[PDB]
Every structure is written in structure tokens, then in C-alpha cells.
């Protein structure tokens, strides 16, 4: 037989097992309020035509005046956050954030470290494998799309397997041409373009006409919980911000193209549930970078 | 700088109840620790000096990942200031005491298996002096008494005299004992010679009179804490009494 | 000003009047940081909030 | 040679106080109410107070520095060196500090 | 020796070269700010029973209290701004509105010029040439997601040529099965599913098996300087409220899907420096565009 | 076939990993700050005829009055900053000075170790390769200003290729007769003496005539970020005062002919990014080197 | 015969026609003279704890006071000063700058504007032709240093005649084995291994024995009145900085290493005198430009 699966979901590497505690979770949530607060008061003393605000947002996330003629980095709050997502990713990456150093950027404010009171929804598609018999090719593309490329040229009809896992919640599947599926020892329905799917039910068995190839579109959905003050958007532009700045470069790690792909990844390899808690804290940092280093470039 | 002060051994065991573990890791790279190299000291010499690093300096060193490289850094904290790298530790241990570290079952260390001679190699017993000697024998023994090794402590205090004659006399388990003591355990103080700002040219002498210099300054400077003139000041807890015991003992 | 070593210290009354606060800012503000000690520190700022 | 702190924390370079932004912090606490929620006069008393200390300090403060230098002049070096050994604190009353400046 | 290009990166048209002074740029930042206090308030208004925030807001964007019975439009606001997006974006747009017009409208709000305070990351991912040698087919779909399809019929191996266009910053390559890449003159490594790559390291090479088809999934990050008042969101959808507004419609002009390959396709165009400096000018003003035109549906 | 690359870019050494932290910065930029007034005040002592302004500034500098027969060298300031130039060199160097001692040294001035207020212009040309024909013969000496001189003794016409790397700006190329350039897959101009280039374009073919030798100088530039107290003369001179002293005299390093060179050498390597900042850091503290022995001399002949 | 020439004296491209009266000379040296207040007032800034300074400086460069949300570009002046360097170097660059900006801004300060009470020494070695006989092969290599490589296959000695133009003050030639060098019509003298020339002299025969190839270096000294506060130190420092920034990016112009070499080469041409007075204006324009760059750099 000929197994196909995904690009993204092979070998996750080991994630990083520091700054997981209360305490630092608590640093975390404070950065990505005052990092907020400052691309606010950046705006406000914008438009006020003085620069009163910006000073106060900046002496608080960086303990000190803003001064001309200086790089304006953020101060200790900067370079605590930027090695604390390094540990994040790989767990050969050195922790290099001193304890005391995490509680006084901590007391800064009053907030809970809370990271499952709320929940977020990821479009990243786990195609685990995809099994297919002799005479016939099958190809995956993609990580949202999933376009699945099939041909048979052969006599016999393919009548080809899929694993979804069983952590996706729902996998809908589209059709250039109407095609049947069904639920392993089930009976074969009417040809139709869509389907929905829930991933638990079980391998799905789909048969392939002789004629022409058929490319099949999935689009899947995960819940997994975050905090509530996670925004999607602002995490994707922070992975990516990272990635450019160089903090993902230990040796012997695995890149992925967005933050989805790599939160999905995790959480099917061995020992995911553990995984993808660091994985949370890991965006939430992610959203308080991209914030901070948009207000102060470097 | 502050645990060299400490002259007494109520003051540095009372200091090392108050210092978490953390303070004994360094967080910077360093250089290895055994290595002959070749420094300048213009001072003295056009050619540059030969000198061999140690363990025992002012400066981090590359450490052990294992247990006993634990134990090495918080040694190396009290005979000379700065500890080692040693990476990646949990911020369980991070958040202990030195004293927990060294008499407590509830940190999962183990070190029932340590070796006094081979630790006492490492952190080279052959450069220390006296006060050095004296504080590296109080770690010992308040790991043997944890460890239930009070016998291997006997065993490795007989085999060397001059350690035997020095060694501190106090029980770990007993705080009458630590107040009968009259031991002086003080690397840096006030100096009644004359001291210079002159360089020194071994790096552990170097490094030693750059903290003798620092504690003088230190003394002077409005962080130190005078007794006799702001005792009311001082917080109940940290006011000095005589009735003043640690946790347990 | 001539030396270092020196020290300024202050005891205030145990229910501080506005002239306490003002004896006090007075001190942080006009005298040298080096001779006002850290627990002096803290009780110039206590007598400030209280 | 030696070295003395220059009276009531004024920098010669900029002829002003060490602290830039003493003049806001002091229009601050003018308008802040203290002690209550609503004004007792605390905040108008105060600022009143410490504007005079300021302006009588910056007036005021070439005369003292050239004071501590003819003392320090006075002084042999092998008396000031023994000097440096000794230490003490000096305990001021409030009312003597606040009428000194 | 065939050449297969993006489809985006062919003939990037000149853009205007007017409107690109101090007091214009500032014009362009008024007229952000001032939309979304229009849109802001039009949102109270309708949330309240009172219609007077709406009115405030129209009157210092058209200059003229609103009427029941005759249209909103906007006043002479929106008439320049309309006019000021047709000329940024080709050369040889008319370029009607008066100077002392734009001086007096900036005039409305005390707000800074500046385009450079800060930064955006756009995801087109720029493949200037893939050259493939004979008997081999390339096949180069899409301008977020690059799918590359190449087949070798013959029995050698073949070896493909990659430029990315030394512009973008990190680019991330997705195979269906693992593949071997390389730069030039390096040894060729293990195959691997996912590679992280830098354009400016210059061109590189990749093997390809025989047996079956192998598709590569490109994603690249480039960051571009761009006002701290940036929001892609509303970027992108302004830019196709104007394209169907019939904004951009000039003789001689290539046309584009987003306003990511926009910028991106300039960028890599000789006087790219100079170009983008203009089309971020743009990008605030379509963002002003899509606020205002939202707010008026008129 | 042939390959040929410039000397200076061949094996850069590691460089130290040590002291490039904010506190170990302030303490370089303090030393080139007072090391700035202790040949200031040099200077004006000649003139009034009274070492008061030495002595004063001195007493700053090393923290002690000197005595007359004692050498003065600068005390403890003058041996951290002297290790620590040692350590930012090579990854092998003992990096043995104290975390106190910085902290101390770093406290004497209000000044921030800010690397990258500014920038400088740094003219070292680098030629990754140069690749040519078999019958044709490339020679590439100088690193300032590299001329590269090519013969073609095969029976017609050979097509070099140039790589500059990506690093550089600005390269500008002369020659000893007009000849031909152009980037890869291009059609060749008309014969020019000059070229502006950007290394960022791509390899370059050169069109080698049969007959004459043809020699082409080339000249580069390349912005690195600096402080503002940067200085290059005075950086040159303390490169050259530290080797002539033997401080560069570490196992497995490489040495070279300026500070120009080296800066542009690490950054012609793998993760030079990083590298470049501490060359940096490396460039102030020897302005400070040289300020300091130039006020203080030690060595007779 | 053969003629070899200097590489960087050929086609001198005509410089600017525009701001060469007398206001526009002052407003050049009022920009030397503010932007030399701005390095030093930095560096005043940076030793103590207020910015007072810099922003004393700052204030009378740009007319406006620094603010923390905005880059310090430099204002008006900034942008007056990097259009006039542009139209100096090239007659076909556009005179943007209007006449009563450059009359402001020169009356900030009070300078006299005159660019020629002082001299500076220029090295540039100028070898307009070298004719050699026919067996004769030679090679000019350098401008600061001039190679001359020379070599006969002849049977007997060969004379080379040196021409080093009617500029240039003094020129020294050494040779790798002493040499015989006379003039026209003058007698040899004996083989010496240092010339010393004046070029205004006329035509250098110098002999060649067969084999041993002869080098001859060659080091040059010009004098150019220029203003007492130019420094060749700061000049070639924003030579190469405005080419870096694009400055000189024009059609139709010739390119060259240095400052140095590029007022040898106007010097030269025919209406070379009234050439570099503009030249030396340029040269005061780039050292203000290397200066406030330096302090405010983007």
C-alpha cells in the first residue's frame, strides 16, 4: 500500500518545559496588558498632540523615562519577554530569565495567569494518513485548503481509507465531481459533493472512479482552550515577527508556516494534552510581542 | 559580596536561610573551568602573566548538569562569591533556600552517593585558605547529617589533618551549638592593614581584593545597616535578639 | 557634603502633622542620597502615607 | 585634590535641580487632594511651601558650595585621610530642617 | 532550459508621483483619523436614541451640518480623497485635487505625517524564477500559498532552480513527500519535509525522484514600513471597495487580487525603495476609503 | 574551474560570547568617556604648567592618587578594560574578569551603552570567489582597494564570474582598458573604465579579450551600526596598539591587517549578525585602549 | 604606439548649474555650521542626564521641537539639504528647492559663505596618457597610487613618455629598480629610484631595458581653495554615504570612489576652473550631510 500524510503534523519537536509555573504565567498575561496599553497610548498621543500619554505607558513597561538619542527597547520587560518565548519553543533552548526578575515585572499589575477560560477556534486540517492501494497516486497540499489529489488507472475501483485523528471536532469535505464515503463496514451513499464529518466516528473509506482524477477539498475545526484575552489575529503577526527576528533558531527543531500549524501539530503528537498548555502561553507571549515591537521597532 | 561578610556562624547560616537557590546560579556562560591561559597584568609585567582557572573564582564557570555540579556552585558561592552555569534547572529548586537545598528531604535531590574527596579536587582544597576551608567543611557536614553519611564525613576528616584541626564544631540539628560557636568565617571586612587599589596577579587574588575594595564601599555607601545608630529603624524580624533561632534546629 | 561617611537622619512624631511631610520631602529632595540611608528611606516614606 | 557632593542636589551644568520634573510634580500636588477625597488645603499648603524651598535653594546655592570648598581647604591631607575612618549620623529635628530651607 | 514565473511580479505599472509631500501625507492621516470617528460615532448613534455624535462627527468631516432630506456624502473630504487614491496609483491619473484644498483639510486635525513609526508583514511569497531543465514541467498556482508542481518524465534526476527575489525575509517550503534542497554547491542533505529558508542566500536547488509528481508549498513573511495607524484588515478591504468602484481604472494598468501582492510585486520592481514609500501612502488612504464609504453608503 | 577568494575573508575565528550584556556596555562606554578626559586633561596641564587637571582626572580614571615612583597604568579600570578586550576576541580567552567589578566601573558615569545610535562607512572589499576558465589566469591582492588581474591565454574570448557577496552596499569597479560586465543571463554594454554596482544583483561576467592582461580595481562600502562616540581613527590605532602589546596572541585565531578587516570578516560568516555586535563593542573598547596608553605610557625603546 | 590613461579621468559628466549665488553658498555653510552643533550637542546629551542640549540643537535645525512618537528626520532643512546635493552632481537632476526656502533657511545663522579663503591638499595622481612603442606592453592601476607596469620585448631600450597633465603641483615616482627619467630634450641622468617632478615641466621620457619588468608608483599633490572649515575626513564619509543613499542615482553620470577622484576628474576637463567651484560646494553639502545623518540617522 502507499501511505500519504501531512506536511506539518511530522515529528513535533520537544516544546519547552520552563516558565509554565503561576508565577510566570502571571508575567506573561501582565506583558500582554501593558504591551496593549502602550499601542493605545501610542495612538492617543498621536492625535493629542502630546507626547504626555506615550511617556506613562513607557515608564511602566519599561521603568524608565523615554529618552532621545536611545534605541527605546522596552527596557527589562523587552528582553525578559523575548527570552522567555526562546525557552518556549525548544526545550534545548537555555532559560536565562531570573525568578526575581519575573516576580517584579509581575507586580507591575493585578491580573489572574488563568489560561482555560475561554477557547479558540483553529482552521489547521489534520490529515493523519492516508491510505491507498497499488496502481493509484494520492497527494496532500496544503494545511487550511487540504487539497487531496487522486487518479486511479486501474480496472478496479480504488476504495482508498482516511484518518482524520481524533482531535478534530468537525472535517468538512468538498469535490470536483460528486463522490461516495462512507464509514469503513457501511453502505456506500448517494454521490454528493460535501460532507460533514466528526473525526471520532471513525476511518473513512471513499471509492474513486476510473474516469478522471478527483481532488478533494477538507476544512477542519479544533477548540482549544486560551485565555480571554487571545486574539487570533494579533498571534499570527507575532509568530511571524519571531520567526524574522531569529528567536526560533535552536538546532534541531521543526518550523511550521503559522501559529495553527504549530499549536495542531503538538497537540497530536504523544503527550499532547501537556503540549499544547505550553503551546497557549507560548501564543498569549507571541500577541504581547507583536504588539510592543510595533510600537517600538528595532 | 554579602555572604563573605558573614563572620559568624549564626549570621551564615541565617544568611543562607534567607538566600534562595537561585543566587548560587549564575545565568552567564563563563569559560571552562580547568584551562592554562595566559592574562594581563600590566601592573607588574609586559608579558603576559600564566594562570590557571578554577572553579573557586569570582567569575561563572561552565558546571555540571548532574547533582554534584549543583553542590559545586553553591560551595563556590560561599568560598568566592559567584556560582556556576548550570542550565536549565527547575524553578522548584530555583526557589529554594541554600539551606533547604543542603538539609532538607522534601527537594528532590539525591546525593546519598556525593564523594567528599572528589568535590574537594574539584573545587581545589590545596588553593583555599583558612576561612575558605572552614566554610567548604560547614556544607559538608550539613549534607552528611541530611544524608545519614556522618560516618564518611569522619572517615574523609581523617585521612586530612590540617581539615581535622580547622573543621567547625557545631551539631546541624542542634541551635545551641551554633551560638557557642567562636569561629571567624570572614572572607572580606573591614581591613585593619592598609589596603590600596592596586591589582593583584592571580585571578582568584585579583577577584578577591576587587570584592575586599567593593564591601569597603559597601560599608560606606547608604545600603549598610549600622546598629548602633538606627536600631530602631529595623524591622522586628530582622532586629538582632538573642533569642533568634532558625526553622527547626 | 565634605564627607560620605556621614549620615542625616529624622524621628518624626507618631501622628505626622503637615509639617512632618514637609520636613521630609524637604530631606529627599535638598540633601544628598548617599547620607539618607535605606531604612531612613523607608521611613520618610511611611510617614508620607500615613 | 578631592571631591565634594554640590549643596541641595543642584547640577552646576544645568543650574537647575537633579530631577527635570520638579516643576510639574509640583503643579501635581497642587491641584491633587490629600487626606480626603474631597480638598483640605494640603495639596495648596505643600506646593506653596516647596516652591519657596526651591526657589531660596537655586538662589542660594553658589554661596554653599563655595563655603564647603574654603572648609575642605582648611583641612591638612594627612588629618582628612584619618577623617575617613570615622563614621556617624546626625539627627535633625523637622522643625530645624524646614525653617533651614 | 525553462522559466517559470509568478504571476503578480510581471510589468508593475508606474505609480503616481504626486500627493507625496509632508502636508499631503499628513492630509491622509486627518482623514483616517477623522473616518473612524465618523464611523465610531455613527455606531453610538445607533446605539443610543440620540443621532447628535453622528452629527458632530459629519460636520467636521464635510465642513456642513447634515439635513434630513438631502444625501450625505461626505463634502469636499470625500471628493478629495477619492481624487487623491486615483492618483497614487497610476501616473497618469489627472491629479485634479489643489494643493491649497489639502492644505486646509489637514489643517482639521493635529496629527503627524509619519509613515514609518512602524511595521507590517505581508505574505505574498515572491518567486521571481523557477528554472527547470528539459523534460521537466513546472507548474506555479497562487500568490498567499505558492503550490509548485513539477514532474521529471525522463529517467536522471533532475535538479530545479529556485529564486525567491532576495527581498523577502524567511521563507518556509511544505512538500507532499520529503525532498532533498540545497544551495549552490553545498552537499545535498537528507530528505526532509520542511525546509526554512533565506532569499538572500541565493539561488537554490532541489532533486527530484522520478516515480510520482512532488508539490512544494512556499509561505513567505517580508515586513514593510508602515504607519502606526495600519490595519490589514480594513487595507484589504478598501482595496476591493475601490476596485469595484471603478478607482482603478487607467489605460496601461495591471491589476491585482490584494493589496498584499501589490505591494509586494513594487517592492520587487527596480525603483522598489521609492515605489513602496508611495503604495504604503495608499494602503492608509484605502483604509480611510473603506471607513468613510462604510459609515456613507453612498 | 578555478576559484579564487580574498585572503582576509578565509576562516573567520569565533568571537567571544562574554561582557556583550547592558551592564557590561555601560562599563565600555564609561572607559571611553573617561579615557576621552585623561588625554583631554593632558593636554591642559601642558598648557597651565600644573598636573592638578592630570591628577584630578587620574583620581577618576583609576580611583587613587599617585604616588611618584609607582608606574601609573590606570589601575583597575585599565586591567578590566584590557582582559576584557581580550575576551570579545577569540572564544578561546580566559574572560576572567569579575561581575562586581564591572558593576562598580560602570557606575563612575551617567552614560548609556547604546551600539547602534549611529552608523559608520567600513571600505574593505569582499570577493566571496571569483571563478574563471582553465586557460585563464586570476590574481586578487589588496583588501582596501582589490585589484584583481586576469590573464586569457586561451585562443578566445572567457566569461569570469564575480561574487561580492551580500553584504556590501556600494561596489565600484575600475579597469586598466574598458571592458565588458553585466549580470547573469544579460545582454553585455558597450566597453566602460567604470561600474556601480549592488552586490545584492547577482554574480557578475567580465568578458576577457585575448591579449593584455586586464586589471580591475574594485572599492566597496558598508554601513554598520556604531555608536555615536565611534570613532575609526581612533578605533584603528588601538587595534594596532593591542596587537603590537600581544593582547591578539591567542591559540587558533586569525589575525588581521585592520579593524576593517576584521568587522567585515565576521560579518562574511555564518550567524554574523551576531557577530558584528560584539565586534562593535570590541571597536569602542579599543578608542578606549588607545586614548588611555596614549595618555599613559608604559613601553620605552 | 599605445596610449594608456587614468581610469577615472575619462568623460567627466557635467555638474549642477543651480545654487551657486551667494545665498545659496550661505545656506550650504549654515548647514555645516548646524549640523556640526547637533554631533557635538549629542554627544553633550549622552555624557549627562538631560537632553536639553539636543533638543536646543534639534530646535534650530528643523524649526519644531523632537517628539518621542515621530523619527527625527531633520525638518526642512533636512530636506533642502538632500535635494541641492542632488542637483550639484548632475545637470540633468531637477532644482526642486525654491529660492525663498533656501533664503530662510540660510538666516538662522550668520556666515559669510565664502568657499575659497582657504586650500586643502588633494592626492589623486593624474596620468592623462602614458605612449609607449610598439613592443611595449603597459598597465595604470590605482588613483591614490598609481602603478604604472611596464614591459618591452624589444632588442633594445624603449622611451616612455609620461604626461601628468598641467594641474597637479608635485609628483613623485619611485620604481621598484632605480630608473632613468629625464625630460624632453635634456640629457639622462643616472638610474635613481625617486623622482621628484613638477608636471607643469613638460613631458617625462623615461628608459626601459629589455627584461625585468619596471613599476613605477606615482603619488600626486593638488591644491583646491575651499572653505576653512571643510575636513577631507568628514567629506569622504558623506560621499560615500549619499552614494549608498542613492543621492547620485541618475542617468547618464559617471561614478567614482572618492571625493578625491572626483574633483581631480572636473578639474581636468575643459571648464574645469568654474567645474570644481561647484565641486567644493558639494563637498561642504556632503560634510553637513555625513553629520547630521550620523545624529539622525533613518
Partial sequence: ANRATSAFLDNPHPVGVNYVDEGSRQFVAVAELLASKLIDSSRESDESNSDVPFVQAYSKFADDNPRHLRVKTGGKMANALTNVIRSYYSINAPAIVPQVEIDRLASKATVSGDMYNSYAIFNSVPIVEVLSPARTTVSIVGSDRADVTMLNTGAGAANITFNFGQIAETVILKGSVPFQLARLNQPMPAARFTYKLRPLDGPFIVVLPVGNPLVISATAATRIQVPLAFNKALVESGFQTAMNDGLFDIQNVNYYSSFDEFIISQYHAQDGINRVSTCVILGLALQAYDQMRRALPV | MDVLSKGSLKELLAHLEKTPLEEAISYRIGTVPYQNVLISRNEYYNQLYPDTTSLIDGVSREGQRNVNGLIMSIISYVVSGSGHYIPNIGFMLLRRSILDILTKHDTGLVTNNLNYGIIARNLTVSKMNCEQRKRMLICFKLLAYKDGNQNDYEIYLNQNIPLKQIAPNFIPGDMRTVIHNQDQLAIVGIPAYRLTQSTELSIRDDNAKSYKLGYVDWYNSNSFLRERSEFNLIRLKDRDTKYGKLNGW | ?50 | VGRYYNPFNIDPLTKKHVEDRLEEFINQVQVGRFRNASGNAVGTTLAAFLRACRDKTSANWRGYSVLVSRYRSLIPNELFESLRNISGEYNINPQDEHSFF
Fill in chain 3, 1 to 50: 557634603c565634605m564627607f560620605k561617611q556621614f549620615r542625616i537622619g529624622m524621628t518624626y512624631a507618631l501622628d505626622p502633622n503637615i509639617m512632618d511631610v514637609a520636613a521630609a520631602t524637604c530631606m529627599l529632595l535638598f540633601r544628598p542620597a548617599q547620607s539618607i540611608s535605606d531604612e531612613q528611606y523607608r521611613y520618610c516614606l511611611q510617614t508620607m502615607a500615613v
